[PDB]
Design a protein around this nucleic acid. Sequence first.
RNA 1: GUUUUCGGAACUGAGGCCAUGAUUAAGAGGGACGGCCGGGGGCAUUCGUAUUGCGCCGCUAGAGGUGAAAUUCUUGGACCGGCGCAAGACGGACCAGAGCGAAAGCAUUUGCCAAGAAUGUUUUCAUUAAUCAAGAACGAAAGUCGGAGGUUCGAAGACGAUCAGAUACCGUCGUAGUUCCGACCAUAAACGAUGCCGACCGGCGAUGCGGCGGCGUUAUUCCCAUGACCCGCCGGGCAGCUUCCGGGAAACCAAAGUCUUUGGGUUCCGGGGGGAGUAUGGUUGCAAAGCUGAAACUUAAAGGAAUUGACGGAAGGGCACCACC
RNA 2: ACCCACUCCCGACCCGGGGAGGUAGUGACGAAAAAUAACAAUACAGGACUCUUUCGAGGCCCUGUAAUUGGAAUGAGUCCACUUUAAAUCCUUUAACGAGGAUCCAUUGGAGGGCAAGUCUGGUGCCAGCAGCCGCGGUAAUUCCAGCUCCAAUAGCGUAUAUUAAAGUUGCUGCAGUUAAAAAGCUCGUAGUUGGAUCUUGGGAGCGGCCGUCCCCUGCUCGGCGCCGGCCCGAAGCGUUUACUUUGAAAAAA
Lengths: 149, 129, 83, 141
Amino acid sequence: GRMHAPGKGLSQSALPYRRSVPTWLKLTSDDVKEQIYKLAKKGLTPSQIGVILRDSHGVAQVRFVTGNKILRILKSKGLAPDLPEDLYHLIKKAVAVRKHLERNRKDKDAKFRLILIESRIHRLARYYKTKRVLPPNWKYESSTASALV
Amino acid sequence: VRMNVLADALKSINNAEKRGKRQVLIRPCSKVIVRFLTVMMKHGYIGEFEIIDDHRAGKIVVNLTGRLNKCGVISPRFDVQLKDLEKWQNNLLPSRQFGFIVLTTSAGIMDHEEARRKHTGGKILGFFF
Amino acid sequence: PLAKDLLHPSPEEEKRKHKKKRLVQSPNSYFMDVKCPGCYKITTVFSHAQTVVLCVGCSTVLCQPTGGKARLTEGCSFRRKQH
Amino acid sequence: GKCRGLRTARKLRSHRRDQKWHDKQYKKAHLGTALKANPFGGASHAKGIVLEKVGVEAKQPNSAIRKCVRVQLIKNGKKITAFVPNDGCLNFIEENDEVLVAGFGRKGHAVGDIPGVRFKVVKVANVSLLALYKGKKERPR
RNA sequence: GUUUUCGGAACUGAGGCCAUGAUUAAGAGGGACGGCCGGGGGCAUUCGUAUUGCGCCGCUAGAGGUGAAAUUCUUGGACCGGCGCAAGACGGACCAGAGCGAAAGCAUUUGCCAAGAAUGUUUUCAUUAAUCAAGAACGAAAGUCGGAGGUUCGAAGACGAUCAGAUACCGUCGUAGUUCCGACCAUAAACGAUGCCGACCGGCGAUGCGGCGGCGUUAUUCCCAUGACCCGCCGGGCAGCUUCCGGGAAACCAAAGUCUUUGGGUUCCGGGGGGAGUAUGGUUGCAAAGCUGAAACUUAAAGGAAUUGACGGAAGGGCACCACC
RNA sequence: ACCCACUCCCGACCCGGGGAGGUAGUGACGAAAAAUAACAAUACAGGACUCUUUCGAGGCCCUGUAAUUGGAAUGAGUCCACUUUAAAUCCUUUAACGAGGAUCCAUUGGAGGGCAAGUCUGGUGCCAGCAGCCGCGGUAAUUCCAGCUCCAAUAGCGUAUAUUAAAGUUGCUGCAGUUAAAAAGCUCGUAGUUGGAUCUUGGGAGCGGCCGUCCCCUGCUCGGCGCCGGCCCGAAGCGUUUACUUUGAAAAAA
């Protein structure tokens, strides 16, 4: 069951049993990391990196090929973003909605969906403060939000 | 959401045996389910089972007789002294002649009758008869 | 039916079922040796691509994204590779 | 119970505590309003002084005249219509007599045919109304 | 006269050594991605009859209205017929036990705007979750305040009937209102009279959305590949039929089942009928009122489901010259 | 009311004082034991047996009821004495008296149902009254008022009121919420509550007849079963932190 919907969807990605790398994949773990760096430098998220990789370069899971996963490869060298991509995207969506709702006070549905998105943010913020990957001093305020692109 | 995985298991193999199934898939898996089942097996209530290893939590497939009248969880896992264990088997089993409260002691997950002779109480997991 | 071989699903039954609900979890995707006739190189494309996989040294654009499986452009062939 | 948490003692106790007030038998005993408005002030019996002898018309079905006695209670100064038991026992009650008065049986609820009379007369002038009815004691005048 | 090894504690530089350190990726959850999907919402634009009013032209005395009439209109030309014009409502038929939305709700065209479920995924984060005192958003209709507009309909009111009366049902007018804008109000039989999350336990053919597969027919004809049908499967949704799963007081419910064989998590909430959602205090509101909310007292029942009968100003069938033809 | 004799306390104190305390009196708060008759002979009746179709015979065997009769009983009371005790009392002991209507007299509530026990008789006539509730009472009242009778508990039994069980009608065990009372209009949301899977196992030592019951699978300052600075081991001190369970200490009597 979804967080802020009645939806009981089951559209999950389903990894195979065999964590063992396939045969055909000729790229060594280092050249995969080198290509991950090349994608990160272009300005892509670990989500967008992983998609571009498995599509055009036949690398199912970076964790399967290498040891580690894409953010931890970004983070080790310091190509990772300061605030997480998923909490970035909710703040990005909240600034989009709030801009729409500046000149559309009639749009009561928007206003309700804003409160649902605000709740997704506060909920993730609270999680990342327990894991100290955000400052304890940090708090998403909608007036301070437009600077956080 | 799913919170007591041992509840999902015992209710699913209870539902299944009431229906008359020869075996039943119980599609999350924990070490506590596996110890509980081995206790039900040692007293011959269920048949020799099978733990399917995916690389997540397992799935178990449990051969059934028609001996298991009911298995069940006690949630929450109440603490049971050796004093109190009479009052549980008094109100939670269908007789003194059969039925077994499983309770997780320090010694290990086991029936109430071994918790007597080992002289160790602990937390009631469930029961079966 | 009361008695079902729950441990031994016949492969007609397993491939029928939802990927998550299979006795062991198993995807419905696969990698393709997609080759265009204009170019020399065999590119590895993911079946459910969801991007525009291009010819590196542009002779064409190979696949186009849809709901499920991507459309392989007319002219292109595919072998499904496995381990 | 609808919260079987191991750490839920106060919710389960504090709910039960709150929902006991929706019981009648509890709400009655555990407020002053039932014990204050009680004409006897929570006592079993009560001596009062007859100020008139009163015929009360029985209920809808059956139809006699129930011979009760209007009483000024000593302790409170409160007004009570109290029934007089067996056949021809209103002949034993001179006016301005100190009568000992009990409940009727239903813990301050109206009994049988008698509308809003919760009390019976037990003794009259400190002589028992059963003893006068059986003729064992004679009325001291 | 000392500084030392020695013990013992701090600050700190290099090397080796550790198999050097990150469990998995939930038929939990968030987020990205993809092509869809929907009377989802907002802003604008656009259309369609119809209604009412107005003007013009025609011909004629009735028209409206009702069970029957009357009020009303009407030779100063009504109603009717034809061409236009204006305004404001409203979106027929298509329109479904169909869809979307948290609920209230949502239906001319087109554009913009952000939003959303579902499916697809060998993408990512990796327990972030479930439910929730406080606090909060939205919340039909009516109603309140200040504007704008006023076509229709129409609380109050004026009549005209019916009637014993008729401050009603019927009819003709008709103010507030109905419409739009800004601000309240926060309630409905706001209903599935059914809290939310999760697991399990029957069968069947349908339908809607996405995906995947399969003979054939048809279109873009010039192959493709996409639509339209066709035959299956998978997930998610609104449903339906059926069954001694089981439950239930039953009616009935694939949930209202998996409950004396009683324990998956959690919120709200009931305790005989009245008194009473009343009095009182607080609080919100301009108001109307809303939220919280007793007691005395009164009472042997009130009530639920089902059965049989009687009864109906309900439906259908049948008989009779004590009924008709 | 009597007393410091008991119990203890106070004092300079083996010696005085104590309405503290003790002893009687009142006492159906309540608790324990426990009389109100037992036994025979007769009429009688029911049940064993030879016997009879039925009646009837016998009672060797029983069992029950009649203000029938007959002695044998023992204490309620009366009461000398001792004992009791500070002095008495009560109790216990014990001379003498002390029972046939054993008048040395058992009540209290009931008898329609719940609920044990009259469809009896006389009275009343929706009156009087009964009746916890349902009900009874308007001329054959099973319910009122009485008589006889029967039932229940019994030296007790009824009544009013608080309170417990019955109440799974407060529900932790364990209730309910479509329609009987009941799910907030809907959603978000903080404390509260609940929260996925996963991190040690195989065998070494020994016994009984393949299965059972035991010991072992952390490391570095001080000495005793010993040895040519340390080997085996004994006693300290550091050792993820809690809940839990088992044991131990400790916890006034009544």
